[PDB]
């Protein structure tokens, strides 16, 4: 049992996870076999060459964010005897300079978010193995440093350097004498307003250039933003990129461009990704000479180029878009326009690989949906945040300018062609809503204030939908025919539906569910279901997972006539059931016994349970996960293993357990993970301490208990050393609440 | 000292407030002389022959919600000869308490289990004017029909108001007293009205038949449509002898057709509710509209046809016959476009002052049509789809939109236009072209990201009250909104800035440009940076709401740049600094708050420190609200720092000691603190009038002999009112928790 770090296996190389643990110095109890050491988010103030003594197998050290919330003091040569050290992360440590005597074995060095104003030869010129060097966020909106001092030729001796990041520094000009090994050069937010033919001298290998945020268009930035005088644009000589023949990635986001010189791309015919977000390029999107110079571009982002105060009728797309033969993804959010016509998108219909069209946040009122049938490989049509109506006729390493998360959930898009119409004005489903759509497999209509009474005919023009997201609407699905035109439906998400037509004796009528042969996942969370009117147990032979949290099972199960005792019983294939957040005080024995026999995972967290009948687990021989967190439980059984042989994970955090019964830390030999964190335990008793057969417990959580650190914590501490297979994570947070002189200390730190 | 009830008076006349007080039985220590006693929301289990004894003068008793049923003995109330008004709501009564005093003018038994309405319970109560029996046999498993025994009401003779709403009745009871003015029959499952149900009720001014055959749209109670698509069935001559009717409620009766004959003999009809029916067809023809020349209020909301989104609203020409109409409610018709053509019939109407078109999903409107009206004051267009123009309580009125459509504070300034919750995501150059002279304008919650530059409002340049709430506006430009010279109220609450520029945002200079701006609300704007070179000068600003911003950041500024940010607001009388995460205010910063202040709120910060001596700088301060902070320190010499302070609110802090000698003060709130005791030294006679209210409930008082010194001071100063005496509660010692401190 290592302490204070959690040691873990990773192929060959053993990692010490030692972060966010309130340490004040480098621990001297780090395993000598450890190869990586994450000491980030602590209170370390001093590093010497003693700090890492006899840790010769160290390959990576992360010291980020120390001291967390005057700088980290690193003595000259502190790291110098670590011969195998490759990666050194020293981010956000308030360093006033580059540490001297860094080891030449380094291939990766991060010094972001410090106060380094001076990049010197003395600091880094001997790091001749360096491949990646991160120096971002150092001389940044800082009254003391007007401009980063880059010693002339400092990087020229770094002949293996492949990645250099200087973003978020007051640079003013590109540093000369960069090594020609450079592949990736990040100069975002550096206050460079002019780029000449000589800035990229000898950089014949460059594959990425990032010049975003120089002369920004300030639109909701998470960092300080300041436009160039006159909101002017970055000035890039015609010939600045003429030698950059390997460039694959070019980021020109937020440079206030109004004009794109076609000649910039002349010698760059393999460019793959071009970011032009947050500029003023509507004119260029219409004439676009540069579009003819990009035969291999795959991703083009032109988002948020709208003209202020403008709402043109139509988007104006140059016919030159038809020259983007390799295009796969087009991002055009925030152009801002009233209607998309068949004709306006003609240039794109020729593109054989175009699979993503992103038109979110354009306030589009009307689209001729049939235009989408005329593409070869359209797979994602993203139209969230527009104004379609019913048709009745921060992390400092972020990519900040690009929409980087999947546009549509991958669980939904994996089914096939995907259409996202969330956050529009589709307040009911018009009879023509889906007319002339391609064969949609994945559909999002979330958050449209949609009050449709579903009747079995609304989705019939797109009958192959497999994943249907209808969350945050006002739908009525009381009709047994609701959604039954969707016979291949697999996943239905009705989370947060509030019913606007409640009829006493009808709502909620859930009969439609029985219709689907292939329905696997159903989310009825936060539907405030407190009444049910189905004659018999609804039966499904397919349903795998039912989410029923945020409803009123407390009312359904307090029914005087016990009508709802059996409501889940006909879910014959169900393995996962979520009954969280249903205000449950006690579940009636007969209601619990009628849960689906097939259950493998049952969540009853965040209720108000004060009683749990453990003996009812005998009825569930497949039960592997039982989640009782966030309740009000006081007692546990002293014979869990008489009630289950399958249970693997038992989660009991945030309850009021003060006592562990004799014979609880077993016998349940199937139990691998037991979570007792955040309860009222003052001690861990002898007898709950037994050892039979093999306590194959491999995770025991205990942090957050008011422990008593007298010699009554001695048993448990001895146990902890007998059973080393049992991991106790976060040992550092298993804290004494008493007596006063032990308070705040780890239960580990007290002597025999 | 009055206990356990708080006993205020109104005439000479005395009222006993004894509600929500955890009482087990009726107290005996009630001021023997009280006229009105309120005992609602308690645990009172029994009312007896003996429960109210010394009270010859009691005119009114309230026993609602006891407990949370109430056992009442025969003749229990007879000893009290003056009783006019008796309230027994939600008491779980199985029967009308027999032998009730004939002195009764008002009786309410709503929300009980009274399935049988007996001549024995009520027939001899011959002086009653108002009787409430609603919510008795309502979706009840044990009662299938309310039984109203024949002629039970016939004798009641002075009865003016009868309510039987929310009861399974199925038929109107026969034999009703002809002195009735108001008859409530909402939600009674009466599917049919005959010629005979109402004949000879010639003094009727109000009839309520709503919720019979409902259209079930978001009801806050159970709702069961008639089977079929079936409307209520009202006989052609049902209202023939109802000549006095002013108020008719037919909401939610699934009407598809209005029989004009129903109105043939109702020359006085004033208010007609037709919400939640199926009246689109009738709205387009409406013969019945010709029969209504005195109607003031017509509600036709939520009559939409399922699944249809017609291009235009189809209003009958017959609407021109509504000569007296003051308000038209047409929510939830659902239509795409409003042209001038479609509202012709209304432009006839000389007194139409309110047009309510909320929730119609309207895409566009010819706004100029609103000029062709004589007396239009309120154009309510909230929850539509207008775009940027370029190139519960059982006494509720459940069906009608009852609150003012627009804040009265806004509407008071003149013609009011409400375009909140539309899609005006920026302000188009044509947004307000051809509008009338708007004085009150609501643009709340439009995701509006307009950069205000001083020209956006030039077509309605006399706006006095502007609601710009819950949007994303940029007002950094010094010209922002300066085309609105007459602006008096600006509400910018919850504005989230989307174009932050370091060194510019927030720039509040535009504020100086107005000579009659009075009220400015910048709450929850997340202001943590300010770029005005000098103190901003307003001579007109009287109230500034600055809550939910970051004064903590502004005031911990290393260069002390924001020390004087409010100083130049020289007329400020009210300042709200709540929810600014304040742990301390620099002495310099506090000294620079306007000397004009009469009212200062710094509640719900995290103040661990307050410099009392600085109140010297505020000779006009009347109210200081320090609630919800973390203060422990009270000065012994408040008198030395202020002779203006009237109200001092200190609840929800951490104070445990009152200093000895602790003039102007009338109201001191020390409730929810950590006071274990007030000591001998903290107390000093004599009365004069001094302070007239002290709050102390929610303190963990030590109930030993120490508290006796206080228990005597209390008796020695009777003009010092202490409320919620029942909640001034012992924590020490073990048996004393948690008795009151009257013991
Ligand atoms: C301007 O555009 C460039 C090119 O798209 C952006 O470069 C990308 O930057 C991100 C984040 O710094 C890099 O992401 C990282 O990928 C590595 C895997 O190599 C992963 O371990 C990290 O967790 C992270 O996801 C990304 O690799 C880089 N793209 C390439 C091809 O190097 C840049 O972020 C944009 N600039 C700004 C300021 O947004
Ligand atoms: C259908 O459309 C809705 C609405 O556009 C999608 O909801 C959005 O989904 C993602 C969840 O993956 C949410 O993004 C998350 O944002 C937080 C930061 O606020 C961040 O912590 C997460 O990493 C993630 O980026 C997004 O907030 C949410 N939008 C709303 C309004 O809730 C939904 O996922 C779409 N459905 C399908 C099947 O794709
Ligand atoms: C309604 O319930 C469904 C089903 O429980 C929720 O969708 C499921 O959400 C979880 C994310 O909590 C998904 O599991 C996650 O998947 C990712 C990616 O493969 C993995 O990295 C995570 O660690 C985790 O396993 C699960 O895939 C997804 N199921 C499906 C079919 O999409 C859904 O989000 C709920 N909706 C709302 C609005 O809450
Ligand atoms: C301008 O438009 C906005 C949006 O319609 C108005 O906000 C609305 O104002 C009223 C307060 O007067 C809120 O109604 C209240 O609802 C609560 C909770 O249900 C209820 O307890 C109160 O009795 C009251 O009826 C309403 O919630 C609020 N709407 C939203 C979305 O916040 C605003 O008042 C209008 N401004 C002017 C100057 O008229
Ligand atoms: C932004 O702040 C303004 C000014 O404080 C808020 O309006 C003010 O709000 C209070 C209601 O909390 C109004 O007081 C009420 O006056 C009526 C008079 O009929 C009185 O009966 C009530 O007891 C109460 O005192 C006050 O009139 C009103 N001020 C103005 C100029 O209208 C406004 O509500 C804030 N906006 C938001 C979204 O919080
Ligand atoms: C039907 O409409 C009438 C108004 O015509 C409502 O009667 C009012 O009810 C409220 C609340 O109970 C009282 O404060 C008013 O004084 C009543 N008006 C009159 C003129 O007496 C009645 O509430 C409506 N019915 C329902 C169920 O909403
Ligand atoms: C389209 O994609 C296919 C599959 O990756 C690729 O083989 C082909 O070259 C692409 N067409 C282009 C780039 O025009
Ligand atoms: C379909 O796309 C092709 C390009 O391959 C184009 O020639 C044609 O005009 C398009 N047809 C329609 C109806 O838009
Ligand atoms: C269910 O929907 C279908 C089609 O709208 C209709 O025929 C049927 O009457 C509906 N059933 C109910 C109970 O409303
Ligand atoms: C499912 O729904 C369709 C359409 O309502 C119907 O034809 C079919 O018989 C239903 N099947 C089952 C098993 O409910
Ligand atoms: C039942 O559940 C399993 C997943 O546990 C799934 O493979 C299977 O398809 C489901 N059975 C049916 C009949 O849908
Ligand atoms: C729990 O369930 C068992 C087994 O069915 C039953 O015998 C026992 O009485 C239950 N205990 C309680 C307290 O309900
Ligand atoms: C309109 O109202 C005014 C004042 O309230 C009154 O003089 C006039 O008679 C009303 N007109 C009607 C009821 O037709
Ligand atoms: C204005 O209203 C009058 C009725 O007062 C009507 O006759 C006329 O046609 C309306 N004019 C316009 C332009 O709508
Ligand atoms: C303020 O707005 C005016 C009018 O639109 C414009 O001339 C000026 O550029 C703006 N000033 C600033 C500092 O943004
Ligand atoms: C209170 O403020 C006055 C004026 O700034 C100052 O003299 C006094 O020292 C202050 N007291 C404390 C405790 O800060």
From Swiss-Prot, chain A:
Example GO BP: positive regulation of interferon-alpha production
MF (Gene Ontology): DNA binding; double-stranded RNA binding; identical protein binding; pattern recognition receptor activity; RNA binding; signaling receptor activity; single-stranded RNA binding
Keywords associated with the record: Disease variant, Disulfide bond, Endosome, Glycoprotein, Immunity, Inflammatory response, Innate immunity, Leucine-rich repeat, Membrane, Receptor, Repeat, Signal, Transmembrane, Transmembrane helix, Ubl conjugation
Disulfide bond residue pairs: 5-18, 139-145, 215-228, 218-225, 412-442, 709-736
Membrane-protein topology: Single-pass type I membrane protein
Regulation of activity: Activated by RNAs having enough uridines.
Outcome, altering residue 427 to L: In IMD98; gain-of-function variant resulting in increased NF-kappa-B activation measured in a reporter assay
Effect listed in the UniProt record for changing residue 306 to A: Abolishes responses to both ssRNA and chemical ligands
Modification after translation (UniProt): Ubiquitinated by RNF216; leading to degradation by the proteasome.
Cellular localization per UniProt: Endosome membrane
Renumbered ranges of LRR repeats: 84-105, 106-126, 129-151, 160-181, 182-202, 205-226, 246-267, 270-292, 296-318, 326-347, 353-374, 377-393, 415-436, 439-460, 464-484, 488-510, 518-539, 542-563, 573-594, 598-618, 622-643, 646-667, 670-691
Extracellular side: 1-752
Glycosylation site list: 11, 49, 57, 73, 118, 205, 243, 251, 316, 320, 353, 374, 444, 479, 515, 523, 573, 613, 685
Residues annotated as domain LRRCT: 705-752
Tissue specificity comment: Expressed in myeloid dendritic cells, monocytes, and monocyte-derived dendritic cells.
Consequence recorded when altering residue 363 to A: Abolishes responses to both ssRNA and chemical ligands
Effect of residue 306 to A: Abolishes activation of NF-kappa-B
Presence of keyword Glycoprotein: yes
GO CC terms in record: endolysosome membrane; endoplasmic reticulum membrane; endosome membrane; external side of plasma membrane; Golgi membrane; plasma membrane
Effect of residue 507 to A: Abolishes responses to both ssRNA and chemical ligands
Family: Belongs to the Toll-like receptor family.
Role noted for this protein: Endosomal receptor that plays a key role in innate and adaptive immunity. Controls host immune response against pathogens through recognition of RNA degradation products specific to microorganisms that are initially processed by RNASET2. Recognizes GU-rich single-stranded RNA (GU-rich RNA) derived from SARS-CoV-2, SARS-CoV-1 and HIV-1 viruses. Upon binding to agonists, undergoes dimerization that brings TIR domains from the two molecules into direct contact, leading to the recruitment of TIR-containing downstream adapter MYD88 through homotypic interaction.
Subunit description: Homodimer. Interacts with MYD88 via their respective TIR domains. Interacts with UNC93B1. Interacts with BTK. Interacts with SMPDL3B.
Connected disease: Immunodeficiency 98 with autoinflammation, X-linked: An X-linked disorder characterized by onset of recurrent infections associated with lymphoproliferation and autoinflammation in the first decade of life. Mostly males are affected; carrier females may have mild symptoms. Features include mouth ulcers, fever, poor early growth, hepatosplenomegaly, lymphadenopathy, polyarthritis, and non-infectious enteritis.
Name of this chain's protein: Toll-like receptor 8
Organism: Homo sapiens
